[PDB]
């Protein structure tokens, strides 16, 4: 309770399966200010640590207790926000200390799940926030400055794209960085080239050959990041097409939520349009890309595509 | 015996034997752009940056 390490040791000694139960009992005893703020600090640190350490238990024995912990966090966040924001700021500062010390060697699926829970909990629709907007630009920097050269980084980008898709389905904003991420991922997947050299990718080793069945039984998004990101070094074409379809589905969801309202979706998608046309000319059996092209063509037909009226203001009296 | 030169908000008339600033024009607001004499050698016209 008083110390994060001490309370983590107590929870581990009691049980990893019912650390949520032990912490809930302790918090109920305590609520019955500073004590509960320290409990919130230790609970956030402990759930991040658990996400970093272990996910071997299945949905029926680990996801249930994780969701119980999430509910306890919802209760303590509905009861307290100031201490939670302060520890969020500290957690930031330590993230960027880690990142400046090691650009890629000091990140965590714990940071990713922290971002996800922050987005789920807070009123993400706010234009400016002491927590959301800082973490928003931190997430942008995370997805942009990472030297994309491996499938674990690709999956990190994919989960970041999913969380910002939630962000801009509840907020409806636009990210040129996620556009660049999509273009870079497509180019590094189909590098195997002559039509795209301004994207400046990093890795010349991974591609996409014509040995995929792309069926429904073929591995879907099914994101087990706490396992996929650490077993992704073994690289089958099934895993490659699964992550490709994951990023493509997130791209389509972002389109259908915000980018239809985006006025320049046509010129946003033009590089993606060329990449997907190359996809179709190379494979000729990609139904989801076909539907994406149909949707973009529909948007081009329905958009005004007319010169704007930016400098049209009313006269002064 | 004389010629006109444009400059910053300033039109200068110089002589030939003296080659000195003979006449000064500074009633412009912004920099002048063009200067031209008439065939009769009396009127000089200047195009400025005010239109």
């Amino acid at each position: 309770r008083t110390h994060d390490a001490l309370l983590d040791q107590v929870k581990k000694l009691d049980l990893d399966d019912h650390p949520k139960i032990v912490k809930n009992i302790i918090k109920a005893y305590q609520p019955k200010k500073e004590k509960l703020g320290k409990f919130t600090a230790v609970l956030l640190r402990h759930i991040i640590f658990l996400s970093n350490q272990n996910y071997l238990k299945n949905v029926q024995s680990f996801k249930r207790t994780q969701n119980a912990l999430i509910s306890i966090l919802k209760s303590l966040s509905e009861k307290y926000n100031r201490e939670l924001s302060e520890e969020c700021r500290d957690y930031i500062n330590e993230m960027q200390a880690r990142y400046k010390k090691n650009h890629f060697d000091a990140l965590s699926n714990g940071d990713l799940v922290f971002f996800s829970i922050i987005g789920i909990l807070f009123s993400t629709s706010d234009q400016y926030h002491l927590v959301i907007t800082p973490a928003l630009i931190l997430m942008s920097q995370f997805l942009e400055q990472i030297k994309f050269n491996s499938l674990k980084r690709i999956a990190f980008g994919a989960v970041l794209v999913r969380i910002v898709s939630q962000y801009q389905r509840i907020s409806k904003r636009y990210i040129p960085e996620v556009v660049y991420f999509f273009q870079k991922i497509l180019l590094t997947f189909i590098v195997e080239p002559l039509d795209f050299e301004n994207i400046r990718l990093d890795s010349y080793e991974l591609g996409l050959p014509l040995d995929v069945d792309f069926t429904k039984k073929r591995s879907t998004i099914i994101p087990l990041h706490t396992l996929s990101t650490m077993d992704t070094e073994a690289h089958p074409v099934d895993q490659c097409v699964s992550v490709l379809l994951n990023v493509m589905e997130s791209l389509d969801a972002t389109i259908s939520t915000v980018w239809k309202s985006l006025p320049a979706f046509n010129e946003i998608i033009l590089p993606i349009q060329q990449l997907l046309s190359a996809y179709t000319s190379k494979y000729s059996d990609f139904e989801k890309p076909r539907n994406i092209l149909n949707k973009v063509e529909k948007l081009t037909k329905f958009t005004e595509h007319i010169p704007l009226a930016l400098q049209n203001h009313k006269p002064v009296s | 015996h004389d010629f006109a030169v444009t400059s910053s908000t300033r039109v200068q008339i110089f002589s030939s034997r003296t080659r000195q600033v003979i006449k000064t024009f500074s009633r412009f607001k912004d920099v002048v752009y063009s200067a031209s004499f008439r065939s009769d050698g009396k009127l000089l016209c200047a195009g400025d940056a005010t239109g």
Binding site: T133, P176, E177, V179, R200, N266, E267, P307, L308, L310 | -
Partner: protein
């Protein structure tokens, strides 16, 4: 140990014979350091440092104090043996022995002072030793810098940046040593050593500050600044002709742009080098960014003297790319953009081409690059108000107070409208960017960051001012933005 006992004996002291024996022991310390290459006396080298201090004290005593020909020959031989032992310890210090290198450098400097006061060849031998020295982490530091040495970097940072006379004789002896064939190849191998020795920005030709004198009697080291320029230019032409790599290439481009120009005397040879650099366009993604500083040098070259580069704005249109956004020199490149596009003979076609290229760039560009490009766009539009039609067409806007015939005509015009801008067209004058509006600036309106969105609202609102302070709104980064937001 034995070194300390010899030190005590020499301090207490046949005094010439004892000093000769101590000098022989300090020359045997070259073999001690050779064995130290495998293990520096259990990786401590404390005895070696004590022996070096003893040798320095003995050399000082010998310089203070000293068959006259035989005695002078013996004293000079002992002093030269100590200096050569220090030079060999510095040269063969493949292992990173910081204390041993520092002791060797201090002993060599003291011996050089004593020789200059009582006895140039010692200087060239010292430089030969320092350049024959090589370390694994020192050879071609690729992430940053030129050569992450130890001995030559400390030599520069506490010995070269202080004495202008030593700088003058320094460059003269490099000219001599480069005329020397084998050591010319030595410099060719250790190019980055000179880069690390020269990027320190406090050289003699920098008349902004003054450098104090090492030798009590400087032998006419202020004979000619143009002679200093000639030595600088000869050394630099030799090094740029020999053994160039990518990181050293970028570093020499930076030092040329910022520091060499005050120190160089063959600007036409710099012209040829810089135009080769700017026309250097290959498939290397790492070598495709040199044209930035290459054009920086070329343009300051054009300013210093009036020469040409054909299809200049053609090359700018070609060179503008998102790789510029991804590289970290885009701040200086935007200063360059200011000083090019500030001309008064540019046209609507050129400004429209550049603004549309930058609009696609800000459609796909990082937010720091967005806040760098916003002031440029605003100032460019304000300077050339001819692009108000593409900012908002007056024919495409509607009004209730006009006839249904014109309503139908406007509807048909909107139906038959098409965007005619061409991206692949390398001619800024030929790209029909006048008709193309900025849906990309509309997306910038619909950005996500609050500060960027406010800058977008500034774009949308009518242009009331001219001064936008490009410098203050020019250098921004992710970390800087986070610091500002937290503050």
């Amino acid at each position: 140990m034995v070194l300390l006992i010899s030190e005590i004996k020499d301090i207490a002291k046949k005094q010439y014979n004892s000093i000769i024996k101590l000098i022989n022991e300090l020359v045997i310390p070259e073999n001690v350091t050779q064995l130290e290459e495998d293990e520096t006396e259990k990786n401590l080298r404390f005895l070696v440092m004590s022996l070096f201090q003893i040798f320095r004290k003995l050399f000082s005593r010998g310089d203070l104090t000293l068959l006259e020909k035989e005695q002078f020959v013996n004293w000079c031989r002992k002093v030269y043996e100590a200096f050569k032992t220090k030079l060999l310890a510095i040269i063969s210090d493949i292992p990173f022995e910081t204390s041993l290198g520092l002791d060797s450098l201090d002993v060599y400097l003291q011996l050089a002072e004593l020789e200059s006061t009582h006895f140039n060849k010692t200087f060239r031998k010292l430089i030969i030793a320092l350049w024959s020295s090589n370390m694994g982490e020192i050879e071609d530091v690729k992430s940053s810098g030129a050569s992450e040495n130890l001995i030559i970097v400390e030599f520069t940072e506490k010995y070269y940046t202080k004495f202008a006379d030593i700088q003058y004789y320094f460059q003269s002896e490099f000219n001599q040593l480069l005329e020397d064939p084998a050591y010319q190849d030595l410099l060719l191998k250790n190019v980055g050593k000179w880069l690390a020795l020269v990027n320190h920005d406090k050289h003699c030709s920098s008349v902004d500050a003054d450098l104090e004198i090492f030798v009590p009697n400087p032998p006419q080291a202020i004979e000619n600044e143009s002679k200093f320029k000639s030595n600088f230019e000869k050394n630099w032409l030799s090094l740029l002709n020999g053994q160039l790599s990518l990181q050293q290439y970028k570093s020499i481009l930076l030092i040329l742009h910022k520091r060499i120009i005050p120190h160089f005397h063959t600007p036409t040879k710099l012209m040829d080098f810089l135009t080769d650099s700017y026309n250097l366009q290959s498939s290397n993604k790492n070598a495709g960014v040199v044209p930035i500083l290459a054009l920086n040098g070329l343009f300051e070259l054009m300013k210093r003297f009036n020469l040409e580069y054909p299809n200049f704005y053609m090359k700018l249109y070609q060179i503008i790319n998102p790789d510029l956004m991804h590289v970290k020199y885009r701040a200086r490149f935007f200063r360059l953009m200011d000083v090019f596009l500030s001309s008064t003979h540019l046209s609507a076609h050129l400004v429209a081409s550049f603004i549309k290229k930058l609009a696609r760039l800000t459609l796909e560009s990082p937010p720091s690059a967005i806040v760098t490009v916003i002031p440029f766009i605003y100032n460019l539009i304000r300077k050339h108000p001819n692009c108000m039609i593409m900012l908002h067409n007056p024919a495409f806007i509607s009004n209730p107070f006009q006839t249904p015939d014109q309503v139908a005509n406007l509807k048909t015009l909107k139906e038959n409208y098409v965007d005619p801008f061409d991206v692949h067209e390398s001619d800024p004058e030929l790209t029909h960017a006048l008709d193309s509006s900025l849906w990309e600036l509309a997306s910038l309106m619909e950005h996500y960051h609050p500060n960027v969105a406010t800058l977008a609202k500034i774009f949308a609102q009518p242009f009331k001012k001219l001064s936008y302070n490009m410098e203050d709104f020019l250098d921004w980064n992710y970390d800087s933005l986070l610091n500002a937001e937290s503050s």
